[model samples]
Target chain A: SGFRKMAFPSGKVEGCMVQVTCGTTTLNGLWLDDVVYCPRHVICTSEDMLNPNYEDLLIRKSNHNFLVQAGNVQLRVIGHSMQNCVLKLKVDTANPKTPKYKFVRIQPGQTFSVLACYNGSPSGVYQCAMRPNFTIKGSFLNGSCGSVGFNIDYDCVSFCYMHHMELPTGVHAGTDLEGNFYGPFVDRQTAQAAGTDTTITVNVLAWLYAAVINGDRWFLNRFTTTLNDFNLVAMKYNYEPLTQDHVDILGPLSAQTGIAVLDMCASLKELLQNGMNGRTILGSALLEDEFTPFDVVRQCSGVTFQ
Target chain B: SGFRKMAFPSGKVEGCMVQVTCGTTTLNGLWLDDVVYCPRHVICTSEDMLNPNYEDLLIRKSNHNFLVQAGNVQLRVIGHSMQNCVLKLKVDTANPKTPKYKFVRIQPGQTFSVLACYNGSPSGVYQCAMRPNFTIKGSFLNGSCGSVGFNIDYDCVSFCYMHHMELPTGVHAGTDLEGNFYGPFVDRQTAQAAGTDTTITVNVLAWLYAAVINGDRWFLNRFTTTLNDFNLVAMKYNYEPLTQDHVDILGPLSAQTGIAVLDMCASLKELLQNGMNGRTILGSALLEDEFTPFDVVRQCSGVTFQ
Candidate 1:
C-alpha cells in the first residue's frame, strides 16, 4: 500500500538552511527584559559575542531553524502600512545591548528592507531591525491581505540554544560538572509545605523550561546547572512513576513537625499560570505546568505531599 | 570563567548502545490493544516484518531514545515480589502478532528472569513476554521496598517511529504520498461543527499523538500520516499566530448556515481530558488539548472559532 524507494527525509547534510515550520514569531523580543536580558552561553568566544549558533547551524537540517529564542529572533514585514516601524535588533548579548550588526529597515521612502539579508555572514551573523510603529495589520480571513501587510520577504538569521537534558533522579534535571546528574528531583531538600495538604518542591530545570517559553527572566536567580545541549538520550519504555522501582526511588517521606509551611500554592499556581499562558504564543511542544505532573507523581500513598 | 576544555557529552559513535532515560514505560502495552494492535510502519522490507529501528540506531546520541512508543516497550522489575509478573512484549508489527523473538520471563519456580537479557538484537528487534497476572506492587514511601514488590532487573528492547513532517497549511500534518506533506493539518475539508459557539476541527495527527501517549489504538481508524522519526527540525523562535502571514493563511470566513455543528463539545472535551489526564500519568510534553491552542489562534478578529 506504500510507495517504493520510500526515501525518508535526509539528514546527512549537517548544515543546510531548512525552513523551520513549527515555531512561533513575535514583535516583543525586546519588551520581555528577561528574554533580551537572559544570558545565553556558547562553548567558545567571549560573553559579549553574538551567539555562534553552532548547535543549530552546525547542528541538523531539522533544527537549523530553531532560530526563535528569547532575545535572538527573526522578523518579517510586507506591504506599506506595516512597514516604517522601528525594531531594536539585539546586537550585543552579554549585557543585552543593541544588536552589533544592526541592519535597520525603513528609510524615508522605502517601507522596509532586509538587514544583512544573509549577504555573507557566518551562520548566525546576520542582523536586521525594523523602525518604530510597525503594525500587525492584515486580514485573517482573506489571505491576510491588506493595503499594508507582511509585504517584504526581508530576512536575517540569528541563533540561540536549548537543553533536553533530563534525569530520572528528580523533577528538575541537569548534569553535574562531571556530567553526572543532579537537579530538583535529586535535590532532596525538605519539601516546602505550601499549605494544610499541599507542599512545594522547586525544579529549576522545569523552571528553565518554562522560562524559555515565556521569555521570562525569572529563572535567572533560580537555576543551578548550565545546559549546553549535548547529552542526548531518549529511552522509550522508561516511564515516570507508579512502577515498583519508581516507588523505590523516593525514600519514605513524611513531613517533619517543626518545618514551617509557607502558604504559597495560590501564588505558585498563579506563577505557573502566567508562565504557561505565554506558551500559547508559540507552537512548540506543550509547556506543561510542572506542578500538574508533580501532582500526578505525588498521588501515591508513600510520597505524601498531598 | 567556565571550566576548561569542558567535554560536551559525546555523540561521535553511531550504532553504539545508549540508554534512553527520560521516556515512560507501562505494563499495559497489551491492554491498550491500540498500542499493541495499532499498526506501526517502519521504512522497511515487509508488512509482516519487525521494525529495524534504523532511525533511532543511526540517529543522534540525544534522541537515542524516545522509546516509549505505542507497541514497542520495556519492563523493569527489582527485588523479588515484582519479579514474578508477566509482560507480553510486542515482537512483530504490521500485524501485531506474537513477538518474533519472544523471551518469556518468570517461572512459577523462579519468580523472574531477564528476558533475552539483551542477547544481541538489532535496534527495535528485541522482544520478551511476561506471563499472565503481573502486578504493580510497591511502596511510595521508604524506597518501595515491599516484601511483594518489583525486584527483578528485567529488560528487552523494542522500537517504534514517529513523524515530524508538519506543513504550513492546516492543523494535522503528514507528508504527501511524495513525502512532501498532507494530513489533517493540510486537509481543507469542511470543518466539523460541534455546537453553536464551538466548532471542532479533527486533528488525526494530534489524535495520533494522543493515541501514542495513551497507548490507545483508536488512531488506527483515523490517521493518514506516518511518523518515521525523521525530518528533524526545530526553529528557535518561530511561533504561532497574530502576525500578518498567519492571518492571511486562513481565508476570510463566514460559515454558510446549515453546515450542521455536531455539538460534540462535551465528548470532545472528555476525549481531550482523558488524553490530557493521561499525560499527567507520565512526564512528557503536555499533550495539549489542541482545542486550547486552536482557540488561541482563532481569537483574532479575522478567524472565528469560539
Candidate 2:
C-alpha cells in the first residue's frame, strides 16, 4: 500500500483537541454539538525504533500521491476552537529499497511530479509533476483540539504538479507539498461522503511523527518526490539558500557521478523511453546524452547524442 | 446517515491501549513492527451530553447494524497486550423521536430481530429476529492499542437473526448486541481489502459511550431495537432475573395497553402488515391477537383472530 502520515500534539496543549475529517466522511454529519479529541496522530507508532516502524514503509511510488485525481478526494485538518501555530509540510522519500530513508521538509512549490494514476485521466501515463493546494486560513487556532496550530481556509484537496523547479532556494517551491504523502486514503464509501483523515500540529518542528510507520511505511523511494529528494529544498531564509545542499546531494548539474541524480537518470530514462518507444535508440544507447553537460548544452540541438 | 461508536480508556491503565483494525485493511501488511494506540473509542463524542453527543444519535435501525450483511463486513477491537477485562454488550434504543433515550445492556441469548437489509439476501423481508455468533477466544490482551477489553475469538461478522424472545429479562436478550450499533459501514474498496473498525473495552460497566452522538445521533427510534429497547436486558444474576423490570415497563402480558409493549405492537404491526399484506383485519384490527394472552394461546391454532 502507500504510507500514512500521523500527527499528534507536541506537548499536549490545554483546551487543544482536533480531529481529521477527510473526504466526505461525516463523523458527526449534522448536529453541531458533537466533539471528540484530535487523534494522537493521524496514525501512530512508537518512536522506539531509531526511525520507528514494524510493517512495510510508505510506498515509494505512484500510490504515495495519497491525493488521487486532484480535488476529487480531500483531507481536512479540523479543530474545535482555535490554536496558534505554524503548520509545516513534512514529507519523506527513499530510493528503490536501501530501506534506509529519512524524512525531508519541503516548501510547497518544489517540482513534485505525481501520477494522476495510470488508471485515471490527465497525464494518464503517470509521473506528471504536481502539487496539492494547502492554505493557512487565519491567525486563529480555530482548530477543534484547542489552541492548536493550522486551520483550513477554503479547500485542501486540489492538485497541480508543474514538473520543474527554478532551482535552489527560490527553487520553484510553494507551500502546499504533499506529493510525498502516501494517503489520506479515504475509505471507499467514505470519500464520497466525508473527508479521509490525518493530523497536524500547531507551531512545531516537522520532527513529530505519527504515520503508520511500522505498517504502511515503504519509504516510497520510487514514486514520492525524488532524486535523493533533491526535489525538497528546506527554505532557510538566512545563510544557506539551500542550493549548496542540493549541490552536495545531487552533485551539481554538469557533474557525471552524483549519487542520487545518476540513480534518478537511470530510472527516469526507462520511464521516458517507454513513453516514447516509437523514436527508438541508436548506438551509445543514449546514456551519454543523459548527462547533457554544460559543454554539451552549448550547441543546444546540434549534437546528435549530446 | 447513522451512528458511530467511540471506545476509550476507563482509568488509563498502564500499558493499556488498543487499536481497532476492521475489515481487510493491511495497515502494515507484511512487516509487523508497526504499532499504534487504541483509539479513545471507536468514535468519540462527549459525556457532556446527559447521554453524550453533539450530533444526531445512533440510527438505531437498519444502518445501525454497522455489520451490514454480517459476514460481508466486519470490525475488530485489537490490543497490544492481553488485558483482563470483562466484555459486556451495551446498546441503547428508543422510540421514534423523543430526543431522550438511555442506554440498555443486554445478554447474548436473546431473540434479536434484524433486517437482512431490504437491499440484499437471505431474509429479504426487513424485520426478522436473529442473532449473530460472537465467540470469545483465548486470554488475549492481543488487541492493538493496549491491554484492552475484548479479543475476537473465532469471528464477529456473521448475522443469523431468526427472531423471537423467550420472554421478560430471559425474554429475548443476548450478548453480541451490535444492531443497535449504527455502522461498521466500511470504506468502499476497504471492505474488500481490510475490515472497517471500532473499539471494545474489557471488564467494565457499559457506562462508557463513544458513538458519534452529537452529530449522527438521531435516537434511531425508527430503525433500532425498540420498546424503550425492551430488546436489551442488563443481565443481573442474583436479585431480579430482570423480567420484573420487564413486567413494570411492559405491564402484564394479558393486559391491553402497556407502554413499550404496546408501542412494539403498533410499530411491529405496521412492518408485519407490509410484509404480509394478505388476511384482512376484522373489528379490532386484530390488535387483540397481537398480545397473544395466555388464555388466547390456550386454543393455539384454533382462533379466527384470537
Candidate 3:
C-alpha cells in the first residue's frame, strides 16, 4: 500500500530557499524579462522589473535575505511547472538589459530558507525566474550487465512562478497535461535481438524506451519551465504538418513520414540494443512503405495523411 | 454547434465469400482485420481444443462495397476517401504454426458477412485475420507553388488496435485521452518538438526499415473488434536503448540507420520549410517494431520514453 502522501526527510520549504538564495552582497545588475504565466506566452511589461522586485512581485514565494542582480535579462522557460522552482531574489530596474534571478538546489526532504528580501522600485509588476534541478540514478548489479547512470536537471520559469506558484513533481498525479495516448514501456520488454533476452528485461526495456522518448521533451520543458515558458498547444500546433501552407510546408506524407519514423526509431533504439528489427520506414517513397502512416492521425488534429 | 451524435456516410461492406474461400490462399493475406469479438485467454484450454463445434468469431463494419476479391480471399476497399491507395491485409495467430484460423474479405456495409472463410474442422477456437490492403485513396489536385504531400502511419498490436476502435472516426482525436497526461504545462505550454518533428520522424523511419529488411518474417498486423469492443488505458512509459547485444536478436541497426538518417533529414527539412517555431511537445513512443530486437509494450499502460 502507498502512503497518503510523500514526505521530505527534512527542510522541505526551508532547504528550497538555500538553493535559490540571492542578495546584493553577492552581486547586482540583474535584469528581468517579461512575465506571462500561461506557460506558453510571456508578456513582461515595463512595470515591476528588477531582481528583488522580480521575486517579491513576480515570484509566488521565493524569499531570500540578500538580493540578486543580473546584467541583461530575457525570458526563457515560462510555464506553470517552471514557476514552482524559483528561488532567491534581487531587483535592478536601472539595468533593464539584464534582469537576473538566482536559485539553490534543495535535496529531497530539504526546504528552502526564506529571506527578508523586498522590492526597491516604487512601481511596476514583478518578474522572477524559476529554476529547479533534480538528478535520478539507478544501477544494475548483475555480473553480465554493466552499471548505467543518469542525471536530470529540470528548471522552472518566472511566468510559472507568477501563474501556477510552485514547481510540480509531475503532471498532477492523476492528471496528464499532454495528448500522448501511450508512453514508453521499458522493464516489461527487453531487446529481443540483445543477449539479455529474459522476458522481464525485454518487456521493461521496451516500455521504458517508448515512454522516455515520447515523454522526454515534455519532461525537459516542464522541468525547465522558468527559462522562456511557451504554451504546449502553441508548440504542438506549430508542428502540425497539415496546418502549414504548401510553400511553407513539406509534403504532408514526407514530413509526417520522416518525423514519425525518427521518433519511433529513437524510442525503439532506446528500448532495445542496436534498436528494433532494423527495418526502418522511409518518406522518400511514402507510397512504397508497407505499413500505413499512423503518427499524424494519432497525434495531430484533422486532415488525415491519406 | 455540434449535434448530439453525427452519422457517417451510410455505406456497405465489401469482399466476402463462402467455404470455397478457405484453404491456404496466401500466408501474407490481405483482408480487413476488424474483429467483432474475441474470446478470453481461458478458451485456449484442452476441453475447447477437443470440442470442434465453435463459432469463435469477430466482425468489423465498413461503409461501401468495391467488390474486391482474390478468389474470396482478398480485401476490398469499401469507401472512397482517397483513390489509388495500396493496402495489405495480415493475420497473426498467437501460434502461427498451429494455423487454427483463416480470413476472407467482406462486402462493404454488409454487417453479417463471412470474414474468415474456412473448410477445415474447427478443432479449437478459430480466429480471423485483419486485412491491411483494404485502404482507400483520394485523387490529388496539383499545386502550382510547390505543394507538399505528407504521409504518416501507426502500428498497433492487440491492445493498440482495441483502443483504436474506441475512437469515434476510428482515428485518434488528438485531444487528450482520459487518464492520459501529456507534459509540464496546464495550458498553453508547448512540447519540445512539433507533433511531426525530426526526432520522431527519424525514429519512425528506423522502425520501417527494420520491418522492410525483416519482411521475410515480419509483416504489419491489424486487429478487429466486435460490438462494444473498445478498451484502452493510453498511458506513458519509458524508453530502452538498443546495444550490440541486441543486434543478435533484433538485427543490425546499421542496416536501417541509412533510412533512419534520411527520415531524420526529411523531418528536419519539413520543420524548416514550415517555419515551425515554439510549437512542439514530446509524447510517448510506440514500443512495437514488427521485426525489431524488441517487442511492443502491452497496450493501455502509462509510460513514456525520454
Q: Given the true complex, what DockQ would model 1 score?
A: 0.03
TM-score of each: 0.18, 0.18, 0.16
lDDT of 3: 0.19
Estimate the overall C-alpha local distance difference test score of candidate 2.
Answer: 0.20
- For each candidate, the DockQ is 0.03, 0.01, 0.01
Model 3: lDDT of residue B81: 21
For candidate 2, the docking band is incorrect
lDDT per residue, candidate 2, B1-306, as tens digits?
111011110111111112222232111000011222222122222232234331233222122222211123232212222111111111122112121112233332221112111111111111111122221111111111112121111212122211111221111211222223112211111222212211111100010111111122111124323433332222211111223343353333213322233343334334333421322121111111111122112111111110
Model 2 stretches astray by more than 4 angstroms: A1-306, B10-261, B268-306
Q: Over the stretch B1-306, how does candidate 1's per-residue lDDT look in tens digits?
A: 000000101011101111112223111122121122111121123322233443442233232222323223432211110011111222222323222222222311111111010111111111111111111110112111100101111121122111111122211122211222212222122342211111112321222332232233321222111111111110111112122232232222212111111212222233333444323312233332222222222222223100
lDDT of 2 by residue, A177-270 (tens): 2222221221111212112211111000011111111121211125323433322222211111223343353343224322243343334334
True contacts kept of each: 0.05, 0.00, 0.00
All candidates: interface RMSD: 23.7, 31.9, 27.3
